[model samples]
Target: STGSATTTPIDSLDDAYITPVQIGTPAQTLNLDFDTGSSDLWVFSSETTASEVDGQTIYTPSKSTTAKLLSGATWSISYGDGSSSSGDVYTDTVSVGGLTVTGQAVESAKKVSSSFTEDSTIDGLLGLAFSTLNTVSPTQQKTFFDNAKASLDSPVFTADLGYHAPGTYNFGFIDTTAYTGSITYTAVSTKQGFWEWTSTGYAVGSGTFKSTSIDGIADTGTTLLYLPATVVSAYWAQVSGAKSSSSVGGYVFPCSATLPSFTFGVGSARIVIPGDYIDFGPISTGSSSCFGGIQSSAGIGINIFGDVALKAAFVVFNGATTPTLGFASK
Candidate 1:
């Protein structure tokens, strides 16, 4: 069966998108971030300490008659941003849109870091990465997509992230009307438990497109685009006031700077990112400095095509043989 769900961006954060998901028999609905960079479906639950609960909703397993505890099983996950969550495991029926998966392993968080506890709007995360990356102990768990794919008419999902708007995540079917132009396909390598791929090259503004291979992952959870240090430096050099600031971290420039567009290669297609998107708003409220959305992927081993980059075009995560990615202008 085919299904689709709307991914809505948080009011002012614009950092990540959230989609509704139902867990357990009585249907405890939660707003979860559909992350393609990691694997493990975890939620704030009755297990979480009251002080750590903040304003987020909690999921209670006892309320769901179908929920079963997985003896001695636990899970722990940490992200590149230093955010983390860990808890015990439970098997239950999880549903997204109209698709349901029985016996799905759901991680009920007992502990969450400040990053998560402070984000009152985000209840948890729904990992869409390969099952090999699941953090469950004793036995790994499958993602909602992985478990539901077998029953789908086609093993695929499309991500249409909008700019300050609601986007749709379609399962098992691709909506041609959602994108314009031809969808250029490229093979992806899941070696690192991510939708990792290499860009043939990139260009800063309208400058020549250099032929430099860039290895990165398409991460929906990440807020900004991260590229090689050299590439980031090249792009910033064109902006008169742009400079790497030790105090600000990453690169910063005058808020009024007229930034240039950035482009990346996707097979034969050239996905162009607008200059405005690269300026990730002012560094601080009423501040004259602005933080750049594109930064160096120095400490982080892999570069990331985060929301800033992904929203520039429509993306298709094809689960067919040799998982592939298709891109097109939206």
Candidate 2:
């Protein structure tokens, strides 16, 4: 949510898995990962020794005379993936696209963990997801969005993830046509950054298998869809030769036969999950497959839509003009 005062930096990642923002003119470029689940923009610094921070894209400050280092304060962040890094604060005259923004603060990590230090192709992460999960406190730093709001064509910001391929996650911008139509948006309760939703019920296939007794929270952070146990069984039963594998996580089904596509009913809308995502890869049980986007949590209190369901459509999260989530076609 934009809240009362709107001014600061904005940082967040795209479901596409790349952060593409303008850096300097037609010359320099700074494309980093922006994460909302955690706060902090960390890039490998040129000052870092090759032995200390090996195999990472080091942001050579010498390339830009406008970049300035912030003295004293140092920052670090940990993730669920068990990765972490630390760096000194710095500010620079940064630009995204043709828009130039000055005094952009970021952290240049000197010490990085194996997960980040091993990636030589990626340089840094610009977090615009939200400040609530930020690792830097007392003076919660401004995100990329907080700094770039002045130049945007629209006060609203939306991240569109088209589909998943070897190299297909595209981030940034909103499709004006999607928001201009007859769209339904749900207001986000101001507190944390996660998009909160009230689930009306759950069903599979032709909405035949019903769970009118269940209620849950919907999250986009998780990559796979989760549901209750009974719903998992009934839905898999309809998938011809599909069966659950005990060796792997018992939450999903495994088999090679063509499985029926599953649809989730959220409020008045129905979201369909493609069959390819079902029984995704090979698991421990012989040729049994790993479900790419399926999990059963029958009677489980929360339901996560994850990227699988979210990527199927274009979602407009309008916190600037209205506190609501708007949906449009991909």
Candidate 3:
């Protein structure tokens, strides 16, 4: 539901990409980013050189009436894309969507590349997807979920992508009306970095997947789902006049054609992706083609499941209790 729009004044926020955080005082606000791909809490400050922060947001401790900074504590983060940020530590009252929490730990970047400053819109990222990749430890930094879990209504949250723009993000609360009943829950894998799982197999147009038992992972950070190449090609065989296009990295078929419903097996439960999910059309470039959710990566880790398939289902991440994850209705 794209409800009625409303208007409000933007704060003194200085072009900083900010996510809400809960710091020590519960009275101040720290701007940060809520990232689904990675887990970390960081910020930018005035001590940083202007050259290092050409386009990034820097919080002036002197400007914040209610917040204070921790001068000695420090933090540094490096992303898979080779981008990095390093800064001193600080604790302040972090607020999001009007809810305030205290004693939140954050890393304030003093030096960062213009690429990160310009390309990113938020002050820092709050990794709400899973706890496995958390950069802040229990002993050192207390993440937003770590402190706010007690007051959260259902120990559940929702990412209303309905309000998401290309650079903007949303957090907290799940839309239960999107699905049939309660979503099926799954345990998080302790593997390094990426979430891992198994897939049952591919399905087309109201059919069952070829394989019943499979293991795979679901990730929001990734844009496309990658499966076994052989499996992908096999699934394409079911489509009429399906042909691989050179323009796109994968297969493209007519979008008018209905796709088969697909499901992946995780533990004893089955996660299903509806038929409409397979139909891909023109998205800003090239021709509109049907891209399969599964791809091939042989002789390598070869298993990376992106968000396309997961979009068919609602996903819930629980870090407050036992660090578990599950899927449910919108």
Where is model 3 more than 4 Å wrong at Cα? 1-33, 44-58, 111-115, 118-122, 129-132, 136-139, 160-175, 191-201, 204-207, 212-217, 228-262, 266-305, 320-323
> RMSD for each model, in Å, please?
1.1, 6.4, 6.8
Q: Residues 72-175, candidate 3, lDDT per residue (tens digit)?
A: 56666676436777777666666666555565666667777665676434555665545556554334565565466676665554432211222222234555
Q: Between prediction 1 and prediction 2, which has the larger TM-score?
A: 1
What are the TM-scores, per candidate, against the unseen true structure? 0.98, 0.72, 0.66
What does candidate 1's lDDT look like per residue over 171-224, in tens digits?
A: 899899999899998889999999998887899998999888888999999989
* Model 2 lowest lDDT segment of ten: 3-12
Cα lDDT for residue 274, candidate 2:
64
Ranking by TM-score, best first? 1, 2, 3
Which of 2 and 3 is the better model by lDDT? 2
Q: For model 3, how many clashes?
A: 40
